[PDB]
Every structure is written in structure tokens, then in C-alpha cells.
Amino acid sequence: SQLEHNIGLSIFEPVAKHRANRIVCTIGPSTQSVEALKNLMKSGMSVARMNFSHGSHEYHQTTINNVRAAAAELGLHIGIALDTKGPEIRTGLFKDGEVSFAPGDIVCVTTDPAYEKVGTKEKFYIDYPQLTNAVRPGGSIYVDDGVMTLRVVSKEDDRTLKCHVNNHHRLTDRRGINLPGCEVDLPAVSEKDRKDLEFGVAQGVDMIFASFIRTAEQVREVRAALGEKGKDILIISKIENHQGVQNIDSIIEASNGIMVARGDLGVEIPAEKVCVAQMCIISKCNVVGKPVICATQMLESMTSNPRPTRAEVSDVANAVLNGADCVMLSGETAKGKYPNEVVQYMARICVEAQSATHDTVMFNSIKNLQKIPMCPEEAVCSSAVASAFEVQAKAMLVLSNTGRSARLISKYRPNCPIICVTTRLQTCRQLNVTRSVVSVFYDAAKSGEDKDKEKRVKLGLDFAKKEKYASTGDVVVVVHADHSVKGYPNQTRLIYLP
Amino acid sequence: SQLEHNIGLSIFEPVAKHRANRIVCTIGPSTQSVEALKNLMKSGMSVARMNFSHGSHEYHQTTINNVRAAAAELGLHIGIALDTKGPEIRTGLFKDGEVSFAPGDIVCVTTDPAYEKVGTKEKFYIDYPQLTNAVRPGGSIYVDDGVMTLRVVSKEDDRTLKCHVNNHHRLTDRRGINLPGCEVDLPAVSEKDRKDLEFGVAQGVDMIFASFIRTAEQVREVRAALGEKGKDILIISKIENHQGVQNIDSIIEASNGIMVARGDLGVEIPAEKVCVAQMCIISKCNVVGKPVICATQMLESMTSNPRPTRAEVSDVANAVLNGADCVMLSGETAKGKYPNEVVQYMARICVEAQSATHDTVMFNSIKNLQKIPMCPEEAVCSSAVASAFEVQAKAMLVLSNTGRSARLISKYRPNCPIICVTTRLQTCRQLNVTRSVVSVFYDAAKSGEDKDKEKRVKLGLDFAKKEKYASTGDVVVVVHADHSVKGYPNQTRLIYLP
Amino acid sequence: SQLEHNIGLSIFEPVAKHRANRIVCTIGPSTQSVEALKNLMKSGMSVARMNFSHGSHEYHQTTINNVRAAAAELGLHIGIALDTKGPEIRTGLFKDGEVSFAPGDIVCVTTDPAYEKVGTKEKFYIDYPQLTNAVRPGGSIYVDDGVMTLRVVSKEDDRTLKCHVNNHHRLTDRRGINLPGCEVDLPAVSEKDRKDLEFGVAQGVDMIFASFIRTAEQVREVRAALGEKGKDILIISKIENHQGVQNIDSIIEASNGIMVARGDLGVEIPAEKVCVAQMCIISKCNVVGKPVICATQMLESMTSNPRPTRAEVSDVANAVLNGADCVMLSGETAKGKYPNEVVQYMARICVEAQSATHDTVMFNSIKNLQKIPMCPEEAVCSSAVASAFEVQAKAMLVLSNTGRSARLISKYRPNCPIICVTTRLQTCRQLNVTRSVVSVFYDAAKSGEDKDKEKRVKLGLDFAKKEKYASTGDVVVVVHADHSVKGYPNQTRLIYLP
Amino acid sequence: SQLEHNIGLSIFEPVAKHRANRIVCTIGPSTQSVEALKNLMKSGMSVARMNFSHGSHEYHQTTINNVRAAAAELGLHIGIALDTKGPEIRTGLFKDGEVSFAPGDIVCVTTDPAYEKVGTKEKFYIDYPQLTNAVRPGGSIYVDDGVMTLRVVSKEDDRTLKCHVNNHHRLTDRRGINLPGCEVDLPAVSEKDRKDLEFGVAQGVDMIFASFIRTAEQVREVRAALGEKGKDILIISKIENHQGVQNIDSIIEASNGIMVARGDLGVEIPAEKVCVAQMCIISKCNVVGKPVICATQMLESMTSNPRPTRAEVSDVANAVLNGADCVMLSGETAKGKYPNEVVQYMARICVEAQSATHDTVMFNSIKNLQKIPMCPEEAVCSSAVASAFEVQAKAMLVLSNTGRSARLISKYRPNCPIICVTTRLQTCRQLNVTRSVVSVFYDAAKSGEDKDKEKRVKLGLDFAKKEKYASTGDVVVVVHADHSVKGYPNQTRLIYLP
């Protein structure tokens, strides 16, 4: 039982030497330089997130170029993620850059763009033109991470609502607006999003973090916007409203993976329900073996402080225990004072949680929920993980070209690294969102077809030695096809390192 | 499996009506007035914590008086806890009252009291005489609640260590010292702590939260200081350093309950290991059936902000899922801007976590770790809880004078309220740290001795109906003694409410 | 696991002192005398079976009278069971008392009663008048425990079939006939059966063993034949054909209990399938808590030998491990040379199997299959058994008037005796088919109403002492109602023997 | 749970097509002819047992020759087992060649060889010199295969016990003696046994069933007698008394396999304890993965009767459910009237029991008791079986030259056939005692060394198709070494049949 496992835990034992979970960092002013990015990589960053809520294409081009230069210097494969603006709603600007409200202040909010730059305490702009269709008298408008609420007193006209301010707040330029419980009808892919996604494809990004995904059909709209040239780019659907949570099964089935986007989610639904959504979404992703990312305010106070709070450490550890492949940083790295330190903390917390995880509970719970008969490659991958447990293997090695076989091994949650030898650089980069996987690139154009697998297996066993995963005489579990079969792995071998 | 449980969770279903977990609030300038306390109680405070690290006896007397007046006004039984200052190691003073250090600075730290009042960049005093035995070259000394760290380079003589400063910091007079991982030998009760415990006994406090408990012998020393007149006051031992963690079994044995005191703990041991200590300590307390409180920075940002961060919500939910009876607020209620709202959030999060808990998993895991044969009262209590699950009882009812039988039922983690009819007001107050229990006072001097239990059972069943735990025709599981057994309950009955 | 349990088994440990399983003995020439019956009772007989396939009412009256006299002498409550003839088919008599057949012998079998007494190798009688409707050319007639088969060559006329003998056999008077795979349409209650059952009621038998039960509706026909005066007599349905096995669920629901009647069953279905039927039927009875009896050839060779074969010992042990309440003897006691010894062997084997049974596997497997919410009396009885395990109780004590509460405790398979204090002698007798139960009669007409349960509880605790189940200072789990509730037990107490 | 499994069984569903368990038949006058042996083989005999307790070398040579001629005619590989006479204690002779005893008779038993030829009612000889050390006053001596029992009253001098006769019996010359529960010290190999083992080695028998193995040292003595030329012959140790049971772990360790020799065992230990020994020994053999045979009186009544009793059917089914690889026939085939029919019944019962077995329960229970880390070949074999369950493979295929890898796969109890391609005919014959395995011989002298395994794999897959284990498009799990590893299999593959 979990209780019996817990009472045997020790703070005095050595922790795992090899970190299984992965860290996604948002790039901004703190971290955009090649130097900064190198230090982030050294600190533990596996994926660079570009937040296309802000910044021009030129700004994000700099991010892309600098990430690639930093990664090339260090010899790493680092994923690059494009996080869409999506159907965001924001206020306009304010006369002065700031305005302050007390409870009972009556304020008009207008969709009329004449007011965009000249917001005051009496009247200001919101950039959602169908506002007065979406929110009725008696309804509420959440402003600025849901910190301030307005009650809609009346509809003055088609462009204007008269509102009652519920609480003290200092409102600044371009804050987020949420309208939970309203019929908000904005596209998953705006014209702006479409241009962003075409930019991502042109520049060869590895994955999209698609904002406010509500339905499977919206996932398909993102995939269509990516086009023929973008068909291998991962779509990670961000779940950040009620309808996304409701439609989670069909969204998971359509997507390559999921982000629990807790910022918007915890304004769209009652903040205390986010914990239940998180547990449920992560476990549903684990069961089907798709990567899942926990996001938002995980180490928030380290934006200004050199150490995290006790709740923040707990939050990161528990996301890992819940079963998340990745954990994410936003403002902590984009604009924080301690971007290297926050990533180093997050990496130490991941490792402690990984080391406090029962070896085989996930393996058995996940396997017990699969339909029998399995496909042969899934019978091979699940039984390979079982054999790694039985022999206490220090590493597994899998040949994967698309990533599929590495993700299938990772699904069964081994307690050792999964070295993936792959023939595609993009697979190297995309496998950064999958727990345990460490990628090695085999250039088949340069080195030959390797039909009998020997070159790639040697490359991975040499990597295992070099990286100090294992040494001579250790057993490694090696998964790939035999000499005939094409398209999937049908074979598992146990090999002693030479 | 936990995985299978998680994938079946819904954010859409109604949550439990009756909150099982309990909230400890620290009282301070935000909360000391009778009116503030009434609001805190309405918001969900069960125990008022006085932090005797600060404030005079006169200040805390006001808290005591105000808590009792507020509780009497609302007809509630509210626990009052005295949290001791405890032992401390501090620096001496510094010339000009401040000194600034930079990384790489080499500083001698001395236990020679000649240097107590004249610390410089070169050399300063620490008031712990065993320092050069406690910490070895290569070890660390932390200064100012962990903010500056020194590495010990060498021992110069039996009173002097040469140290390497790790980071920029400015020290002022008499800053706190922690010796992480080191065996420190300081009395359990200071002369200050004695006067404070004498005050607590005289004023009739319900429990002591005893700081920095390192051994079972220290618990016994606190117990001896409380003396004959304080023999019924609970001792809740605060685990704050590696010794407390290492000696946890014997400490739990000597104590009435445990606090996981994460503030000091996460300075004494690596911050990332606090999660592991927490899980281990909570589960150990569950297994023996003693109350355990999770403390410190749970909803910290609500000191200033009207909503918590996403990490904070998850910290509270996970402390409840871990198995904690109580969660605690410190500066959030003592000095924060939103003391009622923070308690209300904490209550709503507890309820969500409770509603997400698998009914019978804790019950079974706890029961499976008990030594067989049980004592008769524990067999009775554990089988009473089993019967509550089998019939879907809406409440249980137990007669307990000392609290012991109520805690024994709570140990088995029913999913319904445990109504405890007691003949002692202090037992009502003390049972506030125990999950699920709601107390009703039976005045035996007023109503008679009730040898056949019937008056007390009637009071309990009337209370269940009035407080809307159950109505006519519902089953309640009722635990007490038969007509001849004394000293413990040997009987369980299923009764339909008339 | 069972495997892990098995490898820990020892032949060198003491066995259980108190036998839980019960033995049903068939009475005949070996055992009908008062003396013989006393020795059978001393040896371990709990139920005397009268086989109404043979013998007149006067013969069976002698059995009834002699059982009662023997039981009165020894102060025992012994059940008396009436096992119906039912829809049996038999041959007639043969010229000489015997005839011998070789394979290929052509023989006519006739329904014409003119041939009843004068059977020869050429032609003989079968007492089923619709024979030539039931079995077609190409069909098979099984004769004499299915030892000899005839292929039906042709229908000579409405009274006569011409048959081909398949194997060597010596046929004697009045052997059984089976027609598996035929539509045989005989009543569950013939006119003969009706008179037998009215005799059973008039003479106060405890239970009917109803032969060849095919459907629930047939169980209801037996209950109707028993009439107003027979409404409390147990009906134990014997499962001995294909259709009985098919309809097992509805038959179990209609009956008080089941016998796996393996003699006919293993001719009606392929003999090797009987093992599967047995396991399935016994487990289905366990799940609903109705008594189940394993019958036929369990110790067959002891009919003539003073020791059983290795297969026979195994058979008895495995019936007990399968979960059977009772095991039965037929010819072994009815007509055997060693009736006392065979019962003594059967009792020793029962005890060894009981002692090799994992304490709690049955309890947990049975409980896990029950629907929640339970009725209160079933929550009480199941949790009482759990408390007996937790305290290692040496006995349980239940007040039961109908038997229902004793059977409900026995359903959960405690490892200690269940002392049942009952107000009806017939309940004492009927509880002999329920595992673990030992009955004590409380005569309420003589001793008083005992509303507060104290007289009956004292009677049972005194019995526990006298019979050496427990002694002073041992804990007993005592189940009955509190002072108000009527109709079922709502209370469990743990009591130390005074 | 087993309970839940049982309630879902149906007698109506089709049974397994391929029988997993194996049948050992004793050869005698009923079965010795080539034609009788061919029929036995067609009926399901896998191993022919020669009982060297009777018959000359010339007699057993005929069996050997006839078994080989019959097997060659049918193209089968049939194991030949030599079952030793073993050690024995006997009485001396009696005057007039017989003496009759009655209960209460007092008889002196002596180890003084003066009395060897002149035993009387007063005094007779037993040929075991340590008798007065082995058995103590109050102990028992059994005479004539347990039929008469004496209680030892007192020791008269160092060679004489005074005994009390318990039952009527007539002794003739040199009857067997058993000393139940007593430590007996007799050589493992008699001078007779030596000549018999020499004959077995010279004639090329596949296994020895070694009688009355009491210790591991005795197994080693048998192994040493077989010598260099018999080093590949299996030793199956027969457990026949309490010493064998007590020392079972070390005996299993020294042996190739175990027989539960229930005839002698149930004379040496109480008959009712044989069930407990059987379960324990079978499970212990399963856990280490060595073959275990259940023996003696399994279908005894079929010596004379054309159908078995109900107890006999259940004994066979339960030996299979217990986990036995093999079941054995003795007098049923050696001297019975229905040798083919008894083997055919035994096969049909095995198949029913197999079909009633929960697929994966044995697999999981066995795997969970193995010490971790496993050796690589055992991880490979156990994960191969796991993959067979996950894909519902219809067969497995293993290359094994010694038999070791085939036994290792069988240890994990797949539900399908295990095709073993071997390069040794003796390995084909020896694998007949191992559940599920069907052997095919690869002639490496004829077809080549097959370093890359391809010829052997082809032979195995062609065999699967031809014997209708699997057809085109079915998955088969294939276990052997990769192209460089020698000494053991390190590789498993899932292959679709072409």
C-alpha cells in the first residue's frame, strides 16, 4: 500500500542519480540571450517555451536562433515549443498606465476601440467585440487572474456594459479577462494564431502548446492550420476551461499530449477544483501513454526570491508523484531574478519525488488498465520494462525513429533511463516531453542503413557508458526489431555492457 | 488502484457536506479582537494558536480571553494551543551593529564568549559551546534562517572554525543559526519556556506545540515541566530538524500528536526532502492513530493577496490526501490582510481533497498494519468503522470522556462525521485536532451520572438530527460500553434515527 | 497468495481442536439400531439421512425413533433429513436375480409391466412408461451408475425398444437408469414423493434433500407439497443433472441450501466435468450464505476396507477447501463394514483441511462480492467476524431463533466456533448443516422471556467454558440485539469470560 | 479471487484443445506388449515407469525394448523412468510361516538376529538395528504396510521393545515395517539398487524415481552411484516419509524433480496429513521451477471398473489445480483391466482442470516469490510468458539443448503449448515430465550447426503449424539467444506465423 511505502521513506538515503522528469522553461527578457540559454540548459531545461501571447515574430525568431546556438554549443537536443495566444480576452490601456477601484465603484466597459488607449476609472476597453452578447445583467467579469470581479449591472447598449466593482484592485494595462459560465464564441485558431502557426512551421518548431482547447474538433483545426509541412509537429492541448475538462477523453485522443494549464483553469473553475482536475487529467494521460505537462505558479515566489516556499516545493513534488512527465516554469524564468536557481531547485525536487516513488505501482496500475490482446509492440515494450525491474537494469535502450517506441516504453514507467537511439533530430527534440528518455542521434545518411541494428545499439551502449548510466558488466534491456520485421519493435534482449 | 480512482474523478459532482479536516489559525494583530475571532470561527477555525515566540504574557492573555468570549458567543468549543519559543542558537553582536559578507570571504566563527559583542567580517561569535564537535570540515553553518550559508573549511582550535562564505549577505546583531544535519544538544525547555508553560497551565490551555523536539526524552521533559496540574494538556511535538525525523517513532510514542513544522525543517534539511519527511511522518502518525498537523506557508501569498497561487491550493489538498488531520495557518491569519478569506479557501480545499479521497483505502491500509491481536476497544472501533462503510452510515456516535475512543475511531478514517458525546469540556476542545470529530458536551453534574448511557446517546442522536448530519430513518453506528464494562468501549450498535 | 500460503504449510503443527465442517450419514442395516446410532453420533455424525429411494414408512419410522432415542441419551441435537426418491428410473427384476451381457448382444427393453419380474438377457423391463417417447433410435441408455450403455437400434413399438449392448456387464435387480440428453418428463413430486413428504412433515423431519431438482418452480412444488405445517422445514435441492446445473442461480435463490449430488450428476454429465460443477456450485452457495453439501463416493472404498484410498482422503479435504459446509456418506455408513471408522476418518480429514485453510481469504473474498449498502444485521455479522479475527477470539456467540443470524455469521467463515443460543429445538437441529455452528437450546417457556439477553448469553458463555472452547479471561465476540431492537441483531460486544 | 473465478465457471464451454499436464504410466503384464504400449501412447502416456520393486532385469529389458519400438512406430519421444526398490525394514520369519495377533496381545519385538527365523506371538525379529533408539515408549510400529499397528509399551533392553497389539492381524514371513515419525538411518542405495542403476545407465533410461529420499545427502549418493556415464539422467526424489517432508527444501535443491509418493507417505504420516504435504511440496516445486509428479491411487478403482469413482476424478483434477506437472498411474496400467480407458479418463480430467485454472494467477504468484535480481535468462523467460498472455499467443517456441530453458518457461505456467526445439533426443524424452512442453528434435549432425538459430526456428514454427497449435497470422513468442550470446537465451521475439 501507499501507507506502507510512506512509513519506510528515509531522508538519509542517496537519491536517484538520473532525473526522469523534464522541465519546460518559458523564455523572456531574463533568459533570451545565448549565454542565459546555455545556463538554463546546464541547469536542467529540456524544452524552451515561446509565449506568443506577447512579442513579435522578430522577437521569437531571436529566441529560436539563440536556443539553437546555445544547444549546438553544448551538444544538446532541446525542444522548442510555440504556445499560442488563442482566444485570449484583455483590457485596453489606461490613462496613466494604472487605475484604482474600490468596491461599489460603477464602471462602464466598452467594446468600442476608440477607448482602447484611454481607459479610466469611469470607462475602459475590453477587446472582445461580442462582450454584450456573452455576459448578461447579473453576470460577472473576472479581471487580472480573477483578482477583481465586476457584476454586470446593465447593458447600456450593444457596445457598453455598466458594471459594479466588487473589490479593491489596482488595474494596469492589458490585463486578462475571464468569463466563466458565459457562452464565449472565439475561434481556437484566429487569423493571428494562423500566422503564428505558419511561422512555427516555417521555422521548424517541435511542438505547439495550443491554448484554450475545448473540443477534439479544435485540435483538428490546429492540425489543419499547421498544414502538410507541419504534420509531424506535436500538438499539446492546453486544458484551461470547464469545457476542456468535460471533453478531456476526446481531446486526449485527438492530441499528442496535454498541458494542465492551471492559470486560466483556476479562474475558469473554482480554484479548489483544480487539484481534482489535475489528478484526473494526468492519470488519464498516463493510461494512454501520452505526455502530460503540469503548468503555472509551481515556483512562483522564486520570481523575486532566491528560495521557494514550502507549498511550492510540495507542488512540484506532488505533480511528479501524480504522474506528470514534465513540469513548467513561466514568469520564474521569463522575467525572474533567479532563472538558473529556480530550474536547479525544480530539478532537485523532481529527483527527490522520483526517488520517493514506489518502483512498480505505476507499472502495474497502468498495465492492468490496458485492453487484451495488446499489439505486439506494446506487449514487447511492457514486458521489457518488467524485465528491467526483475534484473534491476541500470538502463533500457530502444531504437525509435518516430518516437513511438520510446513513448511506449516510457508509458510503463521504468525506474531507470530510457536511452533512445533515433534517426531523426526532430524526434530527439520531441522526446524531451517524455519521462526518462534520453536521446542519441544516429545519422543514417552518414553512417549507413544499419539493417541489423548493430551500429545503433553500439552507439547507445557507448552513450550509456559515457554518460555513466551503466558500466562494464551491467545488464541493459535493449528493444528493437529482429532482422526481418519492419515498422515496430518485436524483440527484447538482455545484454551485458562489454 | 490510485490510478483507476483518479481517472474516474469528476469536478462536476457535489462535494462532501461535512468537512472532516481541521484548521489551526495563528492569532495576531489581524485576528485578536473578539469580532475578528468570531469571524475566524465562522470561517472554519477549530484551534487558535498562540505563537509565544513573540508577544508578552499580557498580549496572549488577551487572545485567551477573546477566544473564550468569541467561542461562548457562538456556542463553540475551540482549542487553545500554546506554541513555545523553544531553543535557539544565535550569533553574537557585530561592530556598528552590522557586517556585510561576499562570496569567498573567509570568516572565523568562535564559541569564545570574549567575542560575543564585537563580531566583524573576520571573526564572530556563535552561542553554542559544542559547535566544534557538532560540525566538521566540509559541513555547513546556516545563518539568518538559512539565507547565508558558510562552508566549514577547517577547525583552528577547540573553539574556532574557519569558514568560507557562500553568498552575499548583511548580518545584524544576534541572527539565528542552524546546523543542518548536526546533532545539537540543547535543553527541551528554556527558562523562558518554563514561565510560558506555567502561564499555559495556569490559564488552562488545551495543548502545547513544543518546538524543536529532537528525542523522546525531550518530550518527557516537557511533560515533566507541565507537572501534575498540566498532566491532561496534550503535547504536540514539532518536528523541525533531522534528529526529530530520525527519532520520529519514539517521539510519536511519547507525544499526544505531531506537527510537521516545515519552516524550520526546510532550513535544517534540504528543502526538497521536506516532502519526503512530510509523507513519512504523516503516515506514521496515521498508523498509530495520533493527530498530525501540517504547518507553514500553506497559503502564504494570501497574506497579501485575495486568492492563493496554484501551488498553494495543491499543497493544502495534498496535505489532506497525505493523511494529515489538520492544516495550519501562521502569518496568513496572524498578520495578513485577508484572514477570513484564507480560512474559507483552506476549508473549501480540504473539502475537495476529502471528496476526492478513496472511501476505504486508508481504512484498509491502516488496519492491515496493526499488530494482531488488537486490544478489544480497538477491534470494536475498527469494526464499527467497517460497519459504517457497509451500511453507508451517515454518522457515527461515540461516548468518550478522555477523548481516547474518539481518536481510536478517527484513526480508521470513516467517511462520515464522528459525533463524540463527552463529559469534559476540555475533551471537546482537544478533539479539535482530530479528523471528523464533532463534540457535544454532556453535563453530568446537571443531568445525572448516566450509567446506562441512554441520556448521552439521546443527546448525541438529537445533535446529529439538529446539525443535519442525519435524519429520521438514517443508520448511525454507536460505540460505547455495555452495562457492566468500565474503562473502554466494548460494544457497537447500528441504530436507526427515530 | 495461495501459493505463498501453501509453501508455509507444516505437517508438524497442532491441528484445530474444534471441527468446523459437518458430516451427514445415511442410515441403513449397518447403522439403524439405537446403539449403532449412538456410536455414529460419538464418531461425528451431525445429520441422519433417510434415503426414501428404498424402504417403507415403517422402516423409516424406526430410523426416526432410533435417532431421537440415541440423541436423547447423548444429549445431542441431531438433524434428520428425508432424501426423496424423486423421478428415478430403474430396471425391473431378472430371472435368477442376475443376467450377463457381452458387447453386441441385442436386447429388448420394455415398458410393459408384465415383464417386471421376469427380466432376461433377451428382454427386460424399465419402469419409465414414456421411454419410447424419450429415447430415439441412435440414442443411449445408461444402466447401473452408467457402467453399461445400450445403443437404441430401433423402436419396435410404443412399449418396446430394440437395443445394442455396448459393453460387458453383469446386470442385477432394479439398477438405476439414466437418459442424459433426453427429454425425460417426470414430476419433481410424484404421488409417491407426496406421501413421503407428508410423512416427513407428520413425523417432524428437519430438512428435505430434494432429488433431481431442475428449476426453481420444482423447488416451489416441493414446498407446496410440504404444506402449511411444513413451512419451516429446509429444502436442500439436489443438483444432479444438466438442467439443474444450468439453472443453479434460480435454484439457489428458491432453496434453503444445495447438495452437489455427484452420483447422478457424474452420469448425467461427463464425469470429468463434475469437478468444475462442484467448485462453481459450492462457491455460489458460499457467496449467498446458504449451506452446501458435497455428496457421493467420498470414502467409497471404506465400505469394505478399514482405511480409505489416497484419492478419497484428497476428495474429502478438497471439498472442505472448496468451501462445502458438509460432506456426506452413503453406502459407507448405510451398509458398510466400518461405519464408525469411516466417520472418524472423515472427521480427521475435515479438521486437517480446516487447519490448512488461510484464516481470512474466504472472509475477504465473500465480503468483496456483497452489494453495498448491506442490511444492518449483515453489516453487524460481517464486522463481528472481522473483530473475532482482530482479537483472535476463541469463540463467537450469537442469539438466533430462526437460525438466520447464525447462518449469516457462518457465511463470513470465522476460524473459531459459532455458539448459537436458540429458543427452538428445530433450529438446533437445522443448524447442523452450517459450518462452525454449535447449538445450545434455551427454553424460554421454562426460563422466561430474557428480553435483556442476559440468561441466554450466560448459557452460551457457560457452554463455551464447559465444552473447552474458551476459558476465564479469553475474549468472545457476542452478537444479538440491544434492549430495543426486535427481529435481527444490531449489536456486537467483546466480552472476557468471567 | 478464487471465489470470484469459481462462480464464473461454466461446464458448457469448450475445453482447452492442448493438454498441458503429463501422464506417467507404470508398465506391467497388462501393458508390456508393443501393441499395448502403442495404445497407451495414443491414449496419452508421456513417460513409462518401470517398477523395479518387482521383475527381473530381463523383464524390464523387454519393457525398454518394447517402449522404444512402440514409440519409433508412432514417431514419439517417450521418457523411460526407473523406479528403485529402495530401502526397507522387514520382520523376520515366523514359526509355521504365520502367526495371528489380537488386540491387547503383548509382543516383544527384537533386533537380536538370533530370533530372525523363529518369530512367535510372544517375540519376533525386526531387521533394523537402531530400532530401540528410533522408537520410544508410546510411539508406534506399523506392520504390513500399516495394516497392523503396535504401541510401544516399554524398552526391555537395548535390543528389545515390549509392544501392545492394536488390531487383529495375521503376519506371514518378512512383512514390511514402518516407523511413523521416526528418524530412520538406512543407505540411499542398496546393493540391489546399485545393480539396478547400473542396468538403467547401461540401457539409457531418462530418469530415476529414487525411493525413500530422506535427505539431500541421499540424493547426492544416488547421483554418485549413477556416476560419470549417468550424469545426465534426471533424479526425481520420491518423498515417502516425514524426513523427506521435513527436509524438502534441501532435497528439491539437490534433485531434478520430486514425486509425492502418497502410498508410502500415507503409511508413514497420518493419511489425513498427506493432503497438506502434497499441497506444500507441489507449491515448493512450482516456486523453484522443478517438475513434480503426484502419485498413487489416483484412479485406483479403474483397476477393475470401467469408470472411476467421484473421489478419483476430483483427486486428479485437484492435483492439477494444486500445480503438479504430472500425474501417475500404477496398478491401474500395470495390472488393470482397462489400461487405455484409465489413461483416457486421466487425460480428460487433466484437460478440464487445466481449462478451469485462472490464466494468470499462477504466473503472478510464482513471479512474486522470486528473489530480485533474477538471472538474465529467467527475466527473459518470465517476461516471454508475460508477453504471451498480453498478446494471447497460441504458442511459445524455445531452443533448448539441455532442457533448462524449456523448464524455465514452463515454471511461469503459460496457458499455451511450449514448443521446444532441441538437439538432443534424451532432452525430448526428459521434457515429458514438464508441463506444456512439446519437443521437436533438430538433427545438427544432419542439417548443420545452426549458429544463427534460423533452421531451428523454422523447424519449430513448421511444427506448430503441422500439429495445429497455431496457423498463419497467429503470434508465437520465440525465445533463444541473439547472434553472439552463448550458454542461455537472452532474447524474446513476437513473430507472426507466415
Ligand SMILES: O=P(O)(O)OC[C@H]1O[C@@](CO)(OP(=O)(O)O)[C@@H](O)[C@@H]1O
Ligand atoms: O520509430 P518507431 O515507430 O518507434 O519504430 C521503431 C522500430 O522499428 C524498427 C523496425 O522497422 O526500426 P528500424 O527499421 O529503424 O530498425 C525497429 O528496429 C525499431 O525499434
Ligand SMILES: O=P(O)(O)OC[C@H]1O[C@@](CO)(OP(=O)(O)O)[C@@H](O)[C@@H]1O
Ligand atoms: O432468529 P434470527 O432471525 O437469527 O434473529 C435473532 C435476533 O433477534 C433478536 C431481537 O429480536 O432476538 P431476541 O428477541 O430473541 O433477543 C436478537 O437478540 C437476535 O440476535
Ligand SMILES: [K+]
Ligand atoms: K499563450
Ligand SMILES: [K+]
Ligand atoms: K514558536
Ligand SMILES: [K+]
Ligand atoms: K434418494
Ligand SMILES: [K+]
Ligand atoms: K519402487
Ligand SMILES: [Mg+2]
Ligand atoms: Mg492560459
Ligand SMILES: [Mg+2]
Ligand atoms: Mg519552527
Ligand SMILES: [Mg+2]
Ligand atoms: Mg442421486
Ligand SMILES: [Mg+2]
Ligand atoms: Mg513408495
